[PDB]
Amino acid sequence: MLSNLKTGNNILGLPEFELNGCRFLYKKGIEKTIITFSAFPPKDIAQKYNYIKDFLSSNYTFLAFLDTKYPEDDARGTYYITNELDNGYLQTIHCIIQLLSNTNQEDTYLLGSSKGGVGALLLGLTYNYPNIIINAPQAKLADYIKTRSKTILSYMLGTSKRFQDINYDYINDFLLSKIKTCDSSLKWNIHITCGKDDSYHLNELEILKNEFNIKAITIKTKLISGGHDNEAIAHYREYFKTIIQN
Amino acid sequence: MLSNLKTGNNILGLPEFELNGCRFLYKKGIEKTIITFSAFPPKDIAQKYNYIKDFLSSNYTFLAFLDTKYPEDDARGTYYITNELDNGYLQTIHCIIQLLSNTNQEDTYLLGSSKGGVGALLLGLTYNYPNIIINAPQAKLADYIKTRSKTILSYMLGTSKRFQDINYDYINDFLLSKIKTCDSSLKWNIHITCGKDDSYHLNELEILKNEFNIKAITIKTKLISGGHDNEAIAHYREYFKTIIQN
Amino acid sequence: MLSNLKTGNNILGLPEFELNGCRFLYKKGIEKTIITFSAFPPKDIAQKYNYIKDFLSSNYTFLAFLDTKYPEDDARGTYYITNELDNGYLQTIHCIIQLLSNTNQEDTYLLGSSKGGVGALLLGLTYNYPNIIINAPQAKLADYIKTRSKTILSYMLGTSKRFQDINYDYINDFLLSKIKTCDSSLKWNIHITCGKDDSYHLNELEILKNEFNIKAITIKTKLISGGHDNEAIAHYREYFKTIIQN
Amino acid sequence: MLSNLKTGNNILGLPEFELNGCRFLYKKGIEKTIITFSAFPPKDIAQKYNYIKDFLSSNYTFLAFLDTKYPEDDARGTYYITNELDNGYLQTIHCIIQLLSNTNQEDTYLLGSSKGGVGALLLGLTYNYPNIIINAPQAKLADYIKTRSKTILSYMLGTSKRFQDINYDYINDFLLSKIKTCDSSLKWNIHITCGKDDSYHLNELEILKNEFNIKAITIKTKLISGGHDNEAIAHYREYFKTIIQN
Ligand SMILES: [Cl-]
Ligand SMILES: [Cl-]
Ligand SMILES: [Cl-]
Ligand SMILES: [Cl-]
């Protein structure tokens, strides 16, 4: 029962739930369903739910998800991938949305920036959520984790020295594989913004663009002001409300 | 959205849903949640939901589950174990129950006979459902599947000659392993009936009892009229109605 | 080199060869290629090549094959199935035909009676040899091996008590599976005679007929005089020469 | 029929054939049979036949082989091992050579470098080809495949998490196992060159030499100019022309 999944935490008035290690906020509304994904916080700062305030007065249905809770000594998430390096966590998220949401797929919108934007792509490409509006995702996931936490990278590569390189390449390509194996017949509605000064992630977008191109899937991109920073996020927020409100 | 998970089928007035390959009936009720698992049908017979008629006038919340849909050429289920021999299917069942149920865990009851009883144990021991009331479950799963479908066993064993023995043992001990790793401190309320002329499953019950014994779990057992047959099932139905109504 | 594969045996003037445990006779001719398969000899009698005399004065290309050489204490063959219970032996036979024969598939004819007829079906259904003209094959291969040699059956089921039943069913169905998985688009030219007094194999033919029927493949059958005996073989020989000469 | 196995391709005037997934060039000659195996090409480059130009004016019998055609998304071969990690592909190569060659075994020469040299050893040690003259083969096969294609290694490891380690060791030791089980009494004539600056494969050669040593097999070795590169290959070509012409 939903009320028995509560953790005792409360974010801006919304009670937190947890199911199968997956923490989420939920507010039931009407007309549309809004889904958001957490990005990396600073070291020793708790993972944060995204874009609550944007939809506090919206009265749409709202779900916000965090990343995984391991490794315990730097618990900032493993890019929505299980410690078995499989889809178990995304499967849990999909079940929560499908059973708690009161709109259909075409009226559901997936949001997130950076790691949060990768999480939106991972879920939406696996389970055919067509509306994905994100900012500055990575393409090569292991390369980026390496720059943010050596502790998380070494946890995900595992203790066997022989499979560390193998696991690194598998993680690096986990998002690119989802594009390679997604359903080309769906009427995808994918939007990807990126700061014009975000030279690293501008190149990452070119990698994603190429993978969609050889799949004959058309996406929308938009250059916004800023780097990989709060200035870009401020414009990305402005961008997704105008797309959603129209 | 739950209403969009409808398959189109109806069973004795209840609509059928499907989520992540998991087919189920659901009717919202009050006071108690009743969960049932399907057993093996005869060859070329469709998988059936169990004990619907027992709870139509009860107005309890009622959820009934089928086994997996593969192998396609004998689609009678893989003992609620994924083709990867892992917990992915049980995980989906757990999500469905936790979000759709409107009662506490201690007011939830898991029912099933033979393979259905094994499914009830696998879920209950993995995710801490204390009330498990079942009839004549197996202990050695691969030994029994062997007698019902060579096709299904071969599918679960896989195609590699070198891994036949290893996977036979892994499947055979899958439920015993769940007992060995369950939480000894939960207030388990496990009831297992078995027909007095069901010699095979009387011996399976002793194998199960020994695993519970060494985990400091005492269960209740009762011999009823019949073999491994409809007579025993008739008396098992009378039994769980009594326990639930007291 | 072909001449270096000789064994030293010589059958009616034809030197015997062996490649990868596969013994064969070969005579190069023109126009058509004739392939024959050995059936079970009596206990302690050597495996025999079939229908040499029929094509001694024919001047067609001719290949005659024996079954496998194991088990050593009753080496009458394992139905052209390896002791790994796979296609390794048929693969060797196919290579020999493809490299030594000087006609194409449509001008090649596969012949055999009883176990020899099963061998023709096994090879022709795996590798798309359309012309298969045989007498009184079995459908349930393990049931029949049991009646001819307990030593061969126990060798093929293997020493592990747990996999004996599993292997028995797999062998029993090895031919039926080839029909289930063969290419329905080929212009099959399959002829199956059977003695009118051969009540056991008349029923086996009904089993094969049904499996071809659900595959939408049409075959030809013909009742001949005799049981499962030399009278039937004499008429079967008369039958295949008239089909081949026209 | 051999002429019906033509693929349509021609390489420097020689027609390409295919039998049971095994692609090969064949030109009938006299006096000696020369066999070559293909090494790994660079990524996105087609597999190439080796050392054609070396034997065009020689009028020897010449057979050149490619590796397997899978995995389709990096089709550079699986080290002449089947997707079942067994001898089925080597068995096809053996049949082709034994039936098409017009010379004795002791007048047959197996050639190849790096992965091609491993293929020459796998065939020669399995089926008693005494003349093996190769350059810089690997000893630990999975360790090296790891550095050339994660895609190919993952395909050979399979999909089961529980069998990753087991299959890594099985592939890694596949050639060492052939040495351990080969016939010590054959009059082996094995020559292995290696560039003097190819430190990695100098160490691999010592691992191989130790397995031969304990089987009482003495081999000839020679250091040549170069690393693991075209310089070494140029000097290896000069080397095998010398040995074959004396
Ligand atoms: Cl991030
Ligand atoms: Cl059952
Ligand atoms: Cl026979
Ligand atoms: Cl190579």
- DSSP assignment of A152-186, as one string? HHHHHH-S-GGGHHHHHHHHHTHHHHHHHTS-TTS
Chain A residues closer than 8 Å to D146 by CB: 165-166
* Determination technique for this entry: X-ray
* Best to test chain D binding among A84, A162, A174, A180 (most D CBs inside 10 Å): A162
CA separation for the pair B3, B7 (Å, rounded):
10
From the CA of A157, how far away is ligand 1's center (Å)? 19
User: Are the Cβ atoms of D170 and B158 closer than 8 angstroms?
Assistant: no
Tell me how close the Cα of C166 comes to any Cα of chain B, in angstroms: 7
From the CA of A210, how far away is ligand 1's center (Å)? 22
User: Are the Cβ atoms of A162 and D153 closer than 8 angstroms?
Assistant: no
Asked whether D93 and D127 are in contact (CB, 8 A), the reply is no
Q: Which ligand is nearest to the CA of A229?
A: 1
Cis amide linkage into residue A71, ω under 30° from 0: yes
Residue A245, phi-psi category: left (phi > 0), alpha (psi -120 to 50), beta (remainder):
alpha
- Contacts of A185 by beta carbon, 8 Å cutoff, 6+ apart: none
**What are the structure tokens assigned to C84, written together?**
């790994």
Dihedral angle sign, alpha carbons of residues B95, B101, B106, B110: negative
Tell me how close the Cα of D186 comes to any Cα of chain C, in angstroms: 17
* Best to test chain B binding among D81, D86, D162 (most B CBs inside 10 Å): D162
> Which of D222, D229, D220 shows the shortest CA–CA distance to D193?
D222
Provide the β-strand partners of residue A224.
A195
User: Are the Cβ atoms of D158 and B160 closer than 8 angstroms?
Assistant: yes
**What are the structure tokens assigned to D219, written together?**
């081999």
CA separation for the pair A92, B91 (Å, rounded):
8
Assign residue A67 the CATH number of its domain.
3.40.50.1820
CA separation for the pair C129, C108 (Å, rounded):
7
**What are the structure tokens assigned to D203, written together?**
């160490």
Chain B residues closer than 8 Å to C162 by CB: 165, 168
Distances (CA, A) of B83 to B23, B64, B80, B141, D45: 17, 22, 10, 15, 36
DSSP D25: E
User: Alpha-carbon dihedral of residues B147, B151, B157, B159, nearest 10 degrees?
Assistant: 150
Chain A residues closer than 8 Å to B103 by CB: 1
Distances (CA, A) of D198 to A139, B156, C37, D11, D233: 35, 46, 53, 31, 12
For D26-163, where are the alpha helices, taking DSSP H only? 88-100, 115-127, 141-148, 150-157
> Which of A134, A143, A142, A135 shows the shortest CA–CA distance to A227?
A135
**What are the structure tokens assigned to C15, written together?**
């030197």
- Residue at A167: amino acid letter: N
Asked whether A114 and A37 are in contact (CB, 8 A), the reply is no
- The answer to whether D38 is a known ligand-binding residue is no
Query: Would strands A22-27 and A61-65 be described as parallel, antiparallel, or unpaired?
Result: antiparallel
Asked whether D165 and D150 are in contact (CB, 8 A), the reply is no
CA separation for the pair B118, B123 (Å, rounded):
9
* Best to test chain A binding among D74, D140, D146, D167 (most A CBs inside 10 Å): D146
- Contacts of A34 by beta carbon, 8 Å cutoff, 6+ apart: A51, A55, A58, A60, A61, A62, A63, A108, A109, A111, A244
Chain A residues closer than 8 Å to B20 by CB: 91, 94-95
| A near C: at least 3 beta-carbon pairs less than 8 Å apart | no
> Which of D26, D186, D191 shows the shortest CA–CA distance to D99?
D26
DSSP A37: E
Report the interhelical angle of D115-127 vs D88-100 (nearest 10°).
70
Q: Which chains touch A (3 or more CB pairs under 8 A)?
A: B, D
DSSP B42: P
Only one residue has tokens 């390496």, namely: A146
Tell me how close the Cα of B87 comes to any Cα of chain A, in angstroms: 10
> Which of B171, B182, B169, B170 shows the shortest CA–CA distance to B219?
B182
Could you give phi then psi for residue B87, rounded to 5 degrees? -95, 5
> Which of B97, B94, B2 shows the shortest CA–CA distance to A28?
B2
Distances (CA, A) of D203 to D16, D170, D196, D198, D208: 36, 20, 11, 9, 9
CA separation for the pair D175, C186 (Å, rounded):
41
Q: Does B161 touch chain C (CB under 8 A)?
A: yes
Residues belonging to chain A: 246
Minimal-distance CA residue of chain D relative to C97:
D1
DSSP string, C125-158: HHHT--EEEEES--SSHHHHHHHH-HHHHHHHH-
Minimal-distance CA residue of chain A relative to B93:
A95
Could you give phi then psi for residue A13, rounded to 5 degrees? 95, -15
Could you give phi then psi for residue D46, rounded to 5 degrees? -65, 150
CA separation for the pair B94, D119 (Å, rounded):
51
CA separation for the pair C96, C94 (Å, rounded):
6
DSSP string, A101-159: --S-GGGEEEEEETHHHHHHHHHHHHHT--EEEEES--SSHHHHHHHH-HHHHHHHH-S
Chain B residues closer than 8 Å to A103 by CB: 1
> Which of B140, B144, B133 shows the shortest CA–CA distance to B34?
B133
CA separation for the pair D39, D80 (Å, rounded):
10
CA separation for the pair D163, D149 (Å, rounded):
19
From the CA of A56, how far away is ligand 1's center (Å)? 24
From the CA of C114, how far away is ligand 3's center (Å)? 5
DSSP string, C53-83: GGGTTT-SEEEEE-----SGGG-S--TT--T
CA separation for the pair C56, C58 (Å, rounded):
6
DSSP A57: T
- The answer to whether D49 is a known ligand-binding residue is yes
**What are the structure tokens assigned to A69, written together?**
């809770």
> Which of C155, C138, C20 shows the shortest CA–CA distance to C85?
C155
* Best to test chain B binding among A98, A100, A107 (most B CBs inside 10 Å): A98
Q: Which ligand is nearest to the CA of B136?
A: 2
Give residues whose Cβ lies within 5 Å of ion ligand 4. D 39-40, 114-115
Distances (CA, A) of B14 to A1, A42, B1, B53, C211: 21, 50, 18, 11, 39
Q: Does D164 touch chain A (CB under 8 A)?
A: yes
| C vs D: CB pairs below 8 A | 51
DSSP A88: H
- Of the candidates B2, B5, B98, the beta carbon closest to that of A1 is on B98
- Of the candidates B150, B154, B168, the beta carbon closest to that of C162 is on B168
* The C33-37 sheet, strands edge to edge: C6-11, C14-19, C22-27, C61-65, C33-37, C108-113, C131-135, C189-195, C220-224
Provide the β-strand partners of residue A191.
A133, A220
- The answer to whether D237 is a known ligand-binding residue is yes
**What are the structure tokens assigned to A83, written together?**
């410690």
- Of the candidates D146, D164, D165, the beta carbon closest to that of A165 is on D146
Residue C133, phi-psi category: left (phi > 0), alpha (psi -120 to 50), beta (remainder):
beta
- Contacts of A107 by beta carbon, 8 Å cutoff, 6+ apart: A31, A32, A33
Q: Structurally, how many domains does chain C consist of?
A: 1
**What are the structure tokens assigned to A176, written together?**
């690119």
DSSP C30: S
Tell me how close the Cα of D50 comes to any Cα of chain A, in angstroms: 30
D-contacting residues of B 63-102, CB under 8 Å? 84-85
Q: Which chains touch B (3 or more CB pairs under 8 A)?
A: A, C, D
Could you give phi then psi for residue B188, rounded to 5 degrees? -65, 140
Structural domain containing residue C211: 2-245
From the CA of D175, how far away is ligand 4's center (Å)? 15
User: Are the Cβ atoms of B158 and D160 closer than 8 angstroms?
Assistant: yes
From the CA of B203, how far away is ligand 2's center (Å)? 16
Q: Does B218 touch chain A (CB under 8 A)?
A: no
Q: Which ligand is nearest to the CA of B149?
A: 2
Distances (CA, A) of A161 to A84, A157, A158: 16, 9, 8
> Which of B81, B78, B106 shows the shortest CA–CA distance to B92?
B81
From the CA of D116, how far away is ligand 4's center (Å)? 7
Q: Which ligand is nearest to the CA of B115?
A: 2
Q: Which ligand is nearest to the CA of C117?
A: 3
SS3 C224: strand
Could you give phi then psi for residue B216, rounded to 5 degrees? 65, 30
CB atoms within 10 A of CB D43: 10
Integer distance in angstroms from the first to the last C-alpha of chain C? Answer: 36
User: Alpha-carbon dihedral of residues C171, C105, C208, C133, nearest 10 degrees?
Assistant: -110
- Residue at C74: amino acid letter: D
Residues belonging to chain D: 246
Minimal-distance CA residue of chain B relative to A33:
B1
User: Are the Cβ atoms of D84 and B160 closer than 8 angstroms?
Assistant: yes
Minimal-distance CA residue of chain B relative to C84:
B161
Distances (CA, A) of C187 to C117, C131, C137, C183, D5: 19, 9, 21, 9, 20
CA separation for the pair B160, C36 (Å, rounded):
33
User: Are the Cβ atoms of D164 and A165 closer than 8 angstroms?
Assistant: no
- Contacts of A207 by beta carbon, 8 Å cutoff, 6+ apart: A139, A140, A176
* The D22-27 sheet, strands edge to edge: D6-11, D14-19, D22-27, D61-65, D33-37, D108-113, D131-135, D189-195, D220-224
Chain C residues closer than 8 Å to D101 by CB: 1
CB atoms within 10 A of CB C245: 8
Written in H, E and C, the secondary structure of A206-236 is HHHHHHHHCCCCCCEEEEECCCCCHHHHHHH
Report the interhelical angle of A164-172 vs A150-157 (nearest 10°).
110
DSSP D215: T
Measure CA C35 to chain center.
Answer: 9
Chain D residues closer than 8 Å to B160 by CB: 84, 158, 163
Provide the β-strand partners of residue C23.
C18
CB atoms within 10 A of CB D108: 21
DSSP D163: G
- Of the candidates D146, D153, D161, the beta carbon closest to that of A84 is on D161
User: Are the Cβ atoms of C170 and B150 closer than 8 angstroms?
Assistant: yes
